[PDB]
Every structure is written in structure tokens, then in C-alpha cells.
Amino acid sequence: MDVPLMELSGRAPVVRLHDIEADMAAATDAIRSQLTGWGFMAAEVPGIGERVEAMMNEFAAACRATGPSLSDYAYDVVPQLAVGGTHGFFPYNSEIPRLANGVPDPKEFIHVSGAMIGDQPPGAGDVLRAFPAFGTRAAEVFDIAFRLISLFGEVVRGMMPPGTPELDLSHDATNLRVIHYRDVGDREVLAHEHSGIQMLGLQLPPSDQGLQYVLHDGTWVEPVIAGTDVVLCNIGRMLTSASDGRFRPSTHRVHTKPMPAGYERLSSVLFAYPQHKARQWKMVDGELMSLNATWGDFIDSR
Ligand SMILES: [Cl-]
Ligand SMILES: [Fe+3]
């Protein structure tokens, strides 16, 4: 094969869900070595796999449901924050597909924001009431992922100059994306190489292999994560910008092998954002530079 597999199970630091602060402190030196040596980070979080599996299985069942219907909670009929991303269900349109940078996007997916979990703005929580088995599991996984990613953010901050502020990740602005790949046909690429626009991403263990990362030397590898308790932490383009380009974005892609007639591939990722209204900053020449432009401006810029 052109892309070697990358074993992480038994090889990334172990971070216990009931002991997250102390274990992440102990894991800091290894996580720094990963960001330095690889360009992305990884921890093994015992039991997370089964929590994420159950959550994604309830999402698959909600995608199939004939009443209530996920389609009744498309982003265009869900109350959206005045200043914010778009939360809610993103249906697959076969006729005029959503483009990922010009390429048809072979998935249906939901964005569960911290705002939505809190029913903000009012009515945003409706999908989580229509599909309570999914909704309760999505809130659980969001909260576990948010706690993990906030502490990955502290490791990265610790690698930056003194004076580097707290990343101040926004619960309400941060989104859990839950993905059901569909209408794949003969595709071997589900997602061409990209990086997130946000501060950090946390890849939760997917149903299937195929997610790939590029190393600093341009070598593509395939983390062994399907059926594991391994999470991956991604640098987004906001943290590339905040770090004055010190930390490149954790560029990745998703490939697949042919599977049965609409076999269900599932994946979930937390995209962590700072407050849209807060001013940008960059660590330039060893100390903090405040910008006039907001994180919200950073997103619009693209
Ligand atoms: Cl991404
Ligand atoms: Fe991605």
C-alpha cells in the first residue's frame, strides 16, 4: 500500500475519563513530542470508543427514522445564533449537492453546538428532544470531547511563548459534527486533504479506517483508530494564525475501501472555536499582538 498504518493503541498516553486533569498533566511531555514529531496529537481514553459508537449508532437510526424525521431539523428551519456558525442537520441533496471546496460532499451530518445542548437560541434544542437517545449521547460525547480538547489546548499553549493567553474555547461556539457518509458509489475519497478553520479539532474513534494525516516530511499515514479508544487532536487554522505559523494545521483526508450497498460509515469530530465576538491575537516575536479583527472575522475572511 502507498500509505502505511500508524498504530497508536498502546503507544499514545492513557488519559482516564474520570481522571482527565491529572492524566493530561502527566501526558503533556508525550503530547508535546507528538505535535513536534508528527503535526497532530493523540491520547488513548479508555471507554470513549463505546460511548462514541453508541452515540453514532443512535445518529444512524435518527437518519433512517420515519417520524420524528431529522429532515424537520435542517439548519434552515433551526433557530441560529445572531453571531455564530450554523447548527442543525445538513441533509445530503442528490440533485444539487453541498460542495466541500468545489467537490460534492458524500455525507449527511449534524452540528450539535454547545448552544443547542442548552436550547440556545430557544428551539435550537428541538432536535435533541425529537431524538432523545441520540440527544443524551451527543451531549455526553460533546462534554467529554470539550474537556479533552480544552486540555490539549493547554498543552499547545504551554509550548508557546510566556504571555500566551488562555485559548478561551467557547462552549456555545464549539460544535460536535456527527457524520453518516452516504451515496459513496465508486469513490475512494470521502474528504480531500484539508484542515479545520477553527482553533482545535478532536477526532473521536470512527466506525471505519480511512482517515489519514500528513507528517511534517509530507508522508501520509493512516492512524489505526476504528474500534479503538484513541482520540486525535488537530491544529486548526485559527491556532496556526495565533501561533504566527509555528504550528501548521493538522492537514488530513478521508479515504475508503468499497463496502456493501450503503454500508453505514460513521464518524464524529469536535470543532472547538473561541468566542466569535472576541478579538484575534497572535504571538509574534515572542509576545502577544492584539488584532482589531475578531475570530468571527477570521471565519468570514474564508
Ligand atoms: Cl477538519
Ligand atoms: Fe476534517
Side-chain angles (χ1 to χ4, degrees), residues 177 194-198 201 203 213 234-237 250 252 269 271:
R177 174 189 286 186
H194 68 282
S195 68
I197 195 159
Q198 75 295 154
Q203 179 68 57
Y213 288 73
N234 308 154
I235 302 293
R237 285 181 262 134
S250 307
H252 54 272
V269 53
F271 300 122

Side-chain angles (χ1 to χ4, degrees), residues 109-260:
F109 62 99
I110 191 165
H111 278 172
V112 175
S113 63
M116 179 182 280
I117 288 165
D119 193 31
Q120 290 283 337
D126 285 358
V127 62
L128 300 184
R129 292 150 176 79
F131 295 99
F134 168 68
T136 290
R137 296 193 174 281
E140 177 202 0
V141 168
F142 181 110
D143 285 351
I144 294 160
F146 190 66
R147 290 184 235 119
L148 287 162
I149 211 173
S150 296
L151 299 173
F152 281 103
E154 281 289 289
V155 178
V156 178
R157 170 181 180 226
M159 297 178 68
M160 288 175 69
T164 303
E166 286 177 29
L167 296 198
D168 246 302
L169 296 177
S170 169
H171 176 277
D172 286 6
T174 289
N175 282 255
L176 177 66
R177 174 189 286 186
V178 190
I179 298 158
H180 171 222
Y181 295 101
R182 45 171 298 172
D183 290 279
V184 166
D186 70 5
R187 284 190 54 160
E188 68 201 75
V189 179
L190 301 180
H192 286 90
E193 59 173 79
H194 68 282
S195 68
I197 195 159
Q198 75 295 154
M199 193 74 84
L200 293 163
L202 191 81
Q203 179 68 57
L204 298 160
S207 67
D208 290 79
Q209 284 292 123
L211 175 63
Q212 295 179 353
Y213 288 73
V214 73
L215 302 177
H216 293 314
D217 71 338
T219 304
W220 284 90
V221 299
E222 181 178 317
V224 177
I225 53 177
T228 74
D229 287 332
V230 174
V231 306
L232 308 174
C233 187
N234 308 154
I235 302 293
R237 285 181 262 134
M238 286 180 179
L239 188 43
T240 304
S241 169
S243 74
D244 198 26
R246 173 162 181 201
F247 300 120
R248 63 179 182 84
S250 307
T251 298
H252 54 272
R253 77 192 184 186
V254 187
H255 293 185
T256 192
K257 354 67 234 340
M259 289 294 282

Side-chain angles (χ1 to χ4, degrees), residues 68-75 77-78 87-90 126-127 130-131:
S69 299
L70 263 177
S71 47
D72 288 334
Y73 307 98
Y75 59 89
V77 305
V78 173
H87 58 204
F89 185 59
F90 289 80
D126 285 358
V127 62
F131 295 99

